[PDB]
Amino acid sequence: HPDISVDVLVIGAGPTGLGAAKRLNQIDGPSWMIVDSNETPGGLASTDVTPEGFLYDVGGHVIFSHYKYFDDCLDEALPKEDDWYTHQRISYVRCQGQWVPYPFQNNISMLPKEEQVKCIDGMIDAALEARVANTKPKTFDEWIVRMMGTGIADLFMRPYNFKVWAVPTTKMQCAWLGERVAAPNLKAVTTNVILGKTAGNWGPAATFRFPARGGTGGIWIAVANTLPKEKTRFGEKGKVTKVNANNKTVTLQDGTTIGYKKLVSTMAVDFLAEAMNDQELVGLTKQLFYSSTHVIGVGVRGSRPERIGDKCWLYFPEDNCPFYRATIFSNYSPYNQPEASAALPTMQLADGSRPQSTEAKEGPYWSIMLEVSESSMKPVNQETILADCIQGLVNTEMLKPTDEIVSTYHRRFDHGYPTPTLEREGTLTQILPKLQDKDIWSRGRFGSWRYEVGNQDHSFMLGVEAVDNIVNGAVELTLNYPDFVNGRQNTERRLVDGAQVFAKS
Amino acid sequence: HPDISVDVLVIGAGPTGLGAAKRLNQIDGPSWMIVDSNETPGGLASTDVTPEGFLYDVGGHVIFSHYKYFDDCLDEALPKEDDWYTHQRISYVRCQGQWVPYPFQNNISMLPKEEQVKCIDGMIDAALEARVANTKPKTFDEWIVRMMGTGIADLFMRPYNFKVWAVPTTKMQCAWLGERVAAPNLKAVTTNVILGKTAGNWGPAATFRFPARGGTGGIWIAVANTLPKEKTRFGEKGKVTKVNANNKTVTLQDGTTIGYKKLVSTMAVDFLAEAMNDQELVGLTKQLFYSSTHVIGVGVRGSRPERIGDKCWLYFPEDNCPFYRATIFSNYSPYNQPEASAALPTMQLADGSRPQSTEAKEGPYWSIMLEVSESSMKPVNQETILADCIQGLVNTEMLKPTDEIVSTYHRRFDHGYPTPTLEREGTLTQILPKLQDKDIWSRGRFGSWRYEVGNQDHSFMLGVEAVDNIVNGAVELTLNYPDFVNGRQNTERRLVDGAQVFAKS
Amino acid sequence: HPDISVDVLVIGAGPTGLGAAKRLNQIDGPSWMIVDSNETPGGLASTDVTPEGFLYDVGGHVIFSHYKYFDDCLDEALPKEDDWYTHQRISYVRCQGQWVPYPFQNNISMLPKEEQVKCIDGMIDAALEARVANTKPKTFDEWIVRMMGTGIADLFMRPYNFKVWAVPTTKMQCAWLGERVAAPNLKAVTTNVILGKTAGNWGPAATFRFPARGGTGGIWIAVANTLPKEKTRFGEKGKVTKVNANNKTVTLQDGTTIGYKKLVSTMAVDFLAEAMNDQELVGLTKQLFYSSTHVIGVGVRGSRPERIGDKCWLYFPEDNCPFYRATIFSNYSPYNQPEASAALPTMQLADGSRPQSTEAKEGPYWSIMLEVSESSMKPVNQETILADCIQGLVNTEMLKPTDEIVSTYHRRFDHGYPTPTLEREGTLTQILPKLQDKDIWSRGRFGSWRYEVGNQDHSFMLGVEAVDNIVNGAVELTLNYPDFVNGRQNTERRLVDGAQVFAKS
Amino acid sequence: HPDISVDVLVIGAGPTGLGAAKRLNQIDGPSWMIVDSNETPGGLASTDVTPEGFLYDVGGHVIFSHYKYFDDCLDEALPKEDDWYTHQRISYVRCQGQWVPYPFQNNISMLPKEEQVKCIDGMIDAALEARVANTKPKTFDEWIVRMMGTGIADLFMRPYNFKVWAVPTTKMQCAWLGERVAAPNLKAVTTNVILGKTAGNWGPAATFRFPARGGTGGIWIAVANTLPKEKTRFGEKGKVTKVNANNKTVTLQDGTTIGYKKLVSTMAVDFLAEAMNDQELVGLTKQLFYSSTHVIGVGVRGSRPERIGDKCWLYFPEDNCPFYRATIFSNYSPYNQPEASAALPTMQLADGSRPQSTEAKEGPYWSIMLEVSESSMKPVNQETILADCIQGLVNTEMLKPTDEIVSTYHRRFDHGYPTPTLEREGTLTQILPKLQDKDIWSRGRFGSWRYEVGNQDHSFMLGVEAVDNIVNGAVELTLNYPDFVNGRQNTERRLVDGAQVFAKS
């Protein structure tokens, strides 16, 4: 007999596990428990802080919710108007000395005319081919070139996506991008070129909300806090080390054994296989591909420079900087960095020089959060990546050589991106059914490994829907039909359903 | 205060209402009640019997189930292996003196060669147009021609569907048919013509099961029987005459008042609007179109003729019979008609003449079930329709002139088919949301009026999902996404879900 | 017996008839003569002069030669270097206050940006349609819109060609435009828009030569002068009034009869049918369609204005002037108008006012020649068209209100353009073979009625090839295959062939 | 000073040179002379006879005339009705034990059904590709596949043409095949298959005429006889050995020198280059490709076998025989072989056996003429080719093993076919203008090397047109525009033109 027995056990308290727990807590039927090896819940949706007081998410984290259930839980966790800040979705592509508004193709009027001619010629070729196309694209690369044509593909989406995924676009599938036909909007593109016009895909209606305090990590701490504490076990005491699927028993770090009837696992599925000591599953999960994420943070003295302005996140297709994305993290909340009256010495200038004085001086401060990818096809020198990132900030004119840096941050995250390779689905449809046969619901960004449902809201709902399937026979729609859930606002499931309404009466 | 109060009231005990009842009963949370004006549950999925002992469904009723939940409930209701007979899905098209195996286009090698040339020429045109098509078909007719070409369209799907729907194909939408591209399989059609080959779309894996006893109506009687009798009200005592949606109060014909929190209404939505005395809903539901079905039954003396054989249902595009479909109902079950030893006089010969002898004689017997449609665009002489059907049977060689008819049946069902007109959706998205804002779930064949989810399993699940939405916040997938539910095996929802297992412990 | 007998009689001494005569004269075998009702040869390629000394052609006449034979005869007729002036082929379209270089679609960068978007959008549609086109256009209008797209078609070729042809573009065929596929060069057009480029289709290699003296009419006076005079009969003495095809006899105005074996007739074929008293042919030729040409000439005081510059001919699609084409006739030769020291009073100002002063002032002078079409579908008010033309010159900014007009000219030419209507070919194939079977070679701009071979070189060669067919069994390539002769350099036939070289020894 | 001087010298008295001579004789202007190394005119259009009395053309020679001038000369040469025999153009393709009527694709109903399926599927692919094609085929092979589809291409045109040209279809151009779009008549092919029909492209309208006597060579002996004998020089006395283009002098084998002003040369242009001792021209003409032709004749005892019937020529794609084409030469004229009373011994049986008796026995007789190609890519064993051909006759069921052979014939012709290789035009457009610059018209099947105008009528007219250019400035249409002359009835040029009519009056 185990030390503890529950109907449903949940491993992990990132957004996916917390979803499972929130739904179980709402249903309040079967018994349950959630564990995590970190005392702080949140997973990759967590937030670090430097000794100088600059917060950093795990790279750019911007919420767009497809589900009212997700909204209900965030509202419950952070219910006050000044728990949040609202911003427009402002993004740009760095190209040939210019900040080009996203989407790139609608804004190539900013490039030299001779280059515009090449882009348009290429997209004309694609428009004519699309008019007679009778096959689907088979790779990410084919999808890109059929949407954009050669010239525009080569300027942004091809080199950018290699810097992100750390594998060539010819090695990835394209089903994950959804059901839309790969074909250009030639009229929209030539119209903006003719008018010499620029236009972003944002406005008063295209917004996101970010937490006032604690970074993205503030959300999940708050969400976790709504659960009954005694059904949680976070920290070293909550670290899973063994999973015996045949006896339906988990063993924790300190030796505690937990019996379950159903298991929701949200740790990386390659880690789960190892914990199960299942050679077959180990082999299979080693054939999944993923990239690692280096997060670099830079804290800068001074008020926000005009050239940065209201920018939120930024794309970097070119080879003069190692990062694929930059976020102006100080624009997300004034509490993501110290207040203007806090005093910090300058650590270095952006060109690498020593400051004239080592004395602590006042702010205000602004802040840049950078992402660099790593894989077996794309090594990252961990001892120089910070300095390379800062040199990249100068090359891209985000920072002047004279800008004063008062804080630095670097951390590597082993499982960063689950890669939509050509082989992914072939491998996943061997792994997930075997786990399912053992009453194990392996779910989440690395729990079920599908990037197209890999954001916070997807993850949270993968947990929720996993519980709903276990208990109420719900379809796991987010897991099996990404296009379905991403193409609609999912409104039916709420934090208060009829069941709880009728029971209370 | 009303005579009765329940959380969920279900109106109608056809398959939809029974689905709602079955799921409410399983969940065993909210209080509930189901009413029907008829003492016998089943609705359009019921069965009549003639005074001579011949059973007739409301036209050809063949079950193909898309859902594990539906299967669970039929199995619980009729658990014994001898409660069912299994048959292959054998159908033919009657055309120019021949029985042509369905699908029609794969079997035109049976037609005269000059006619095959015309067919293939038409399908070649359609193939070539499909190759460069970039628009979706907008009408049922357009869809048919794109799929078949003119020649084949004119032989079967065009005149057949007029006889079914009682409106021109040019007046119907085609979205209801699914997401498949409207284009011919030219190679498969020409291959069978070249090989001189015929092939039906059936075999040992393409089967259906039919109840041993009581016809299709036997299923819904037995399903209803598993419900707690005190929560049912079937007969004159259960006829709904008035719905007060603002008071959430229903009044029955005997004066009984029932108050509700949520209403699942499965009566025809035009009848619901009338009962609500809601003039705006009345005006809207009169914009919907439907056809009536005439069901004609013919009982015949003799063992099953060789020319008929194992045929199950049959399609009639041509003008020499008024019916669009025939069913060899005596093939579906031995107990659909009297035993051989039963003595019955001959009523008439199939050519209309009086029999030589008026004496009761023995069998065996077989049985034909016919459907004739009617609408404002296609009137039907009710006084001659029986004699016309029987002459139709002689014209199509189903009956010899000398065949002895021992039983006849005719019944008109006013709401027979909800028509997929071009206007259907524009109307329904005014009706269904307006009802739902009043907490009324109007569902089913005429509850929500969508033929493409209009069979017995669909109807049952519309009831189930409505309840699942009311209680567990489930997506009503069958209602809003026909293509989704019809395109997969729906296995997640069962008659015993985790909820009931964990609670029983 | 007739007064005169020849082997080959030629009617008409415009370029077609003169071509016949030159080749007959070179071959020097069969006897021949040529007649014309005009004392001066040249037909529609003649030149008028006003009492004030301004020359006008019959509208703008620019030579482009497809044949060495034509070149040899012009060189012979006018052998000196100063018999000719050479110019680049410079033309513009007047549109929205601008002189847009021809071809229009490569120069729309001059229009407002919003016009450019409409133009490119329309051409994108036409490009995408051309990609799947598998039928030839059936009308001139279809050809235009398939070539240019709606927006560009509407700005120039559609309204311009109505003003030229005096019939809707929808009523004309398009085979006459040659064999090139009706499809846009989208890339060339967008490239010039993107780059802000204009470029005319002329330069040092695209030139024409114009006679130094006597206008275009000087060429045919001089060609006719190389013929033996006694074989010509020009003037009232040479006016044909009767053709008796059965007797092979022609009757002249003065009673002279001419017997012939073969007749080359270059008068308008409808006039030929009348002269023949052949009611059947008159009936057929009345089914052909043609437009009349009003030529308006305007002599202006002043040195050539900068705004005019080196322009040669100009197109006018807009409805702010009656004329379809303007020619800067003073640019073609300094002897097309009087020398600077010639004294002329101002007749009127361009604004329409007439000055009191009769003072004769000096020059220099320049000159504008205008063309307006007329047909039974497009009446022209003869009494006001001069004044309307002049106001048109002011609206298009060719003349200033205050410019001084010292000479005016207006003449209406009944047969101006042979129209390539939809019916033309059908009618010609009933006419031309019938004349052929009577040994009548009816040829020329209205002799055989085909505009695509209706220029001076074409006309000359229809004469030449007609004689070559009669004598040497030559293929009449220009008559039956306009695409053949227009698509190559015709160099084989010369004014001195081998026959004449070998004979000389 | 040369031994003889003429204005126009003609080398060669095959059909081309005889064309030039006939036109010079008609014109009767410039002095001329024609020479040949052979005493008998005809070239490759000559005829041999075996010592047993069987005639053989140089392979299958069937006249289809595109020109009235050609007909005039043939009529003049053989004016009597019984100088000619008329036959329908009956041809078949030998394939898989069947005689399949030409054209192959319209008669694949004779193949096994399973093969008809593969054939039709292939053509369905080709039809669908044709609907969206926007390129012209660039090789003979691409042309074949676009016309026929893979399956039909593989059965006939691909293997047959390798057997004809002795080069692969991927190495030849396709322009020579004309302007028709490379695309299938899918409806024509599927129609005959569905109907089970065979039909050839012949009937009462599709005929050819063949000389009663002397074979095809009889035509050219008779044409040559119409020339003034003294302007001819045929035999060893007429053999050209040197051409001195700079001096315009030809030297003959007997030492005779002839001066000329223009040279029409109809010998193979590679031999011409040698005779000119021009090394640049020798190099260039060595880059032309050509195949040799082996002609095999077999005389057979017996009346015409039923299985042979009215067959004229036959195509052999398959690998069980070395010949690509057979001709039933005995069907063309009864004088192509001895009369029935002529007595001959049997040389061998068709399987190679000795006859039972060596006695001369009577006929009747029939006769087979075979063609086998040779090149550097396809050697021919001259010592075994007769026997291989005879075995091929048995393999193809043209001869029974018991059939008695009474005469055999074999002869190799070095220049047989001029090959339309990919390189042909690039070479010829370097050779022909250089010869032209020296007043040398090189013309004919190997004079100008173009197969698409390489028939008797083409060749004859190449010579006619060359003279017409030399004397009258005619366009050499047949040389430069094969599609033009082959696509029309060329009726204008006659043996009696107007020039000769007018001179005689």
UniProtKB/Swiss-Prot annotation, chains A, B, C, D:
The keyword Transferase does not apply. The keyword DNA-binding does not apply. Keywords: Cell wall biogenesis/degradation, FAD, Flavoprotein, Isomerase, NAD, NADP, Nucleotide-binding. Changing residue 89 to A: Lowers the catalytic efficiency by a factor of 125. The UDP-galactopyranose mutase appears to be an appealing adjunct therapeutic target in combination with other drugs against A.fumigatus. Galactofuranose is absent in humans yet is an essential component of bacterial and fungal cell walls and a cell surface virulence factor in protozoan parasites. Thus, inhibition of galactofuranose biosynthesis is a valid strategy for developing new antimicrobials. NADPH binds at residues 66, 89, 91, 102, 201, 313, 315, 417, 445, 455, 458. Changing residue 325 to A: Abolishes the catalytic activity. Changing residue 315 to A: Lowers the catalytic efficiency. Changing residue 91 to A: Lowers the catalytic efficiency by a factor of 14. UDP-galactopyranose mutase, key flavoenzyme of galactofuranose metabolism that catalyzes the 6-to-5 ring contraction of UDP-galactopyranose to UDP-galactofuranose, the donor used by various galacto-furanosyltransferases. Controls the biosynthesis of galactomannan and galactofuranose containing glycoconjugates. The flavin functions as nucleophile, forming a flavin-sugar adduct that facilitates galactose-ring opening and contraction. Changing residue 64 to A: Lowers the catalytic efficiency. This is UDP-galactopyranose mutase. It comes from Aspergillus fumigatus. Its cofactor is FAD. Binds 1 FAD per subunit. Its EC number is 5.4.99.9.
